[PDB]
Amino acid sequence: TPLVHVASVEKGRSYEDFQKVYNAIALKLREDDEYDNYIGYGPVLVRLAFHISGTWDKHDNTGGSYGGTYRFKKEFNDPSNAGLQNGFKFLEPIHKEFPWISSGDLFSLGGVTAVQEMQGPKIPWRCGRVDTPEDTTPDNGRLPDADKDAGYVRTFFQRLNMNDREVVALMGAHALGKTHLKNSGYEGPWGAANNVFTNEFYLNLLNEDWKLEKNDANNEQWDSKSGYMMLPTDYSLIQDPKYLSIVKEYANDQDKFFKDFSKAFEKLLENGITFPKDAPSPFIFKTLEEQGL
Ligand code: HEM
């Protein structure tokens, strides 16, 4: 009925092979630090990992990270994906260097690398994604809109099998990077340390004095006097009672948040994939720092 996407390890590669891809990405993150006014490419990679995974549909098993379909024009030119071409271009040279890795594996590894190199938690990762044909490319319109409420969010996430806790954990990724008017019709960062992974998102949500205003693209956003912004969907996390109690917990305990994020992120990246019993267990990569590089 539903497609079956069985993970198949890149022939003859082991842990050491993947750690090398990881190190290459990480070294290039360290090196191209001027991107986006010195934010670096971390945030854009994280966003890319979400976008390639978020097209999944638990009803017929289409979309998700397995097929590396973002590589095709249709998905590539998805209006919801505007701005991601920057993460793509960042990874190309890496792919050229390690041509045996599948796309889905590369896109998803980039997210993991980014998180860990920005001092986030360790995210166990699995290889085995296999490139699929251009016709397995999902139609545009499966990614979420920003101008909605908590109801919308819950519903949307349900399509990916995520519960409340998972939604809130994943959203703390909004501590990174910022919105760009030309990309999404929104402008401004969510906080101050936008290239270090922390629970800042939750603190800003609870602690700032947010004002609803229209931006230059004529969209509504929540603006704070500190110069931060929140999308309607971010703001909805404090409008929903179930969401709000989790926001508070995270605001209160970065460690808890890191644990929840880690699990949720890996789940997101593995949705739609079947891992045979002989498949290697998830790898945990060392950072540059841990290797002394
Ligand atoms: C309701 C769900 C979500 C909505 C509506 C949403 C919407 C957006 C929008 C409109 C942008 C700005 C794009 C631009 O102008 O460059 C953005 C950026 C971003 N998104 Fe989300 N997002 C959602 C969930 C997530 C999740 C689950 C993650 C990862 C766990 C994520 C990671 C990011 C990151 C890191 C950025 C900043 C990228 C940069 O600085 O280039 N988002 N998101």
Short mmCIF file of all heavy atoms in Angstrom, two decimals, residues 19 88 140 164 170:
data_model
loop_
_atom_site.label_atom_id
_atom_site.label_comp_id
_atom_site.label_asym_id
_atom_site.label_seq_id
_atom_site.Cartn_x
_atom_site.Cartn_y
_atom_site.Cartn_z
N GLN A 19 32.16 9.76 9.62
CA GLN A 19 32.80 10.78 10.49
C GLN A 19 33.61 11.75 9.62
O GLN A 19 33.72 12.95 9.97
CB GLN A 19 33.65 10.18 11.59
CG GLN A 19 34.37 11.19 12.47
CD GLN A 19 33.46 12.03 13.36
OE1 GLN A 19 33.24 13.24 13.20
NE2 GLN A 19 32.96 11.40 14.42
N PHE A 88 22.35 24.31 -0.08
CA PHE A 88 22.60 23.35 -1.16
C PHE A 88 24.01 23.61 -1.72
O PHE A 88 24.86 22.71 -1.72
CB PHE A 88 21.51 23.48 -2.22
CG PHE A 88 21.70 22.45 -3.30
CD1 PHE A 88 21.33 21.12 -3.03
CD2 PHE A 88 22.29 22.80 -4.52
CE1 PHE A 88 21.50 20.12 -4.00
CE2 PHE A 88 22.46 21.83 -5.49
CZ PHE A 88 22.09 20.49 -5.24
N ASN A 140 4.65 20.35 -4.27
CA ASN A 140 4.82 21.51 -3.38
C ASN A 140 3.56 21.66 -2.51
O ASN A 140 2.47 21.22 -2.94
CB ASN A 140 5.02 22.78 -4.20
CG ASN A 140 6.26 22.82 -5.06
OD1 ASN A 140 7.23 22.03 -4.95
ND2 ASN A 140 6.24 23.84 -5.94
N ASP A 164 2.70 16.71 21.07
CA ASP A 164 2.90 18.09 21.55
C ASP A 164 4.34 18.36 21.98
O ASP A 164 4.92 19.43 21.67
CB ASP A 164 1.91 18.40 22.68
CG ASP A 164 0.49 18.61 22.16
OD1 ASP A 164 0.20 18.60 20.94
OD2 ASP A 164 -0.33 18.75 23.07
N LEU A 170 11.04 20.65 18.85
CA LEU A 170 11.59 20.96 17.51
C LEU A 170 11.62 22.45 17.19
O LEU A 170 12.48 22.92 16.42
CB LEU A 170 10.72 20.21 16.50
CG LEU A 170 10.99 18.71 16.31
CD1 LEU A 170 10.00 18.19 15.28
CD2 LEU A 170 12.43 18.53 15.82
#
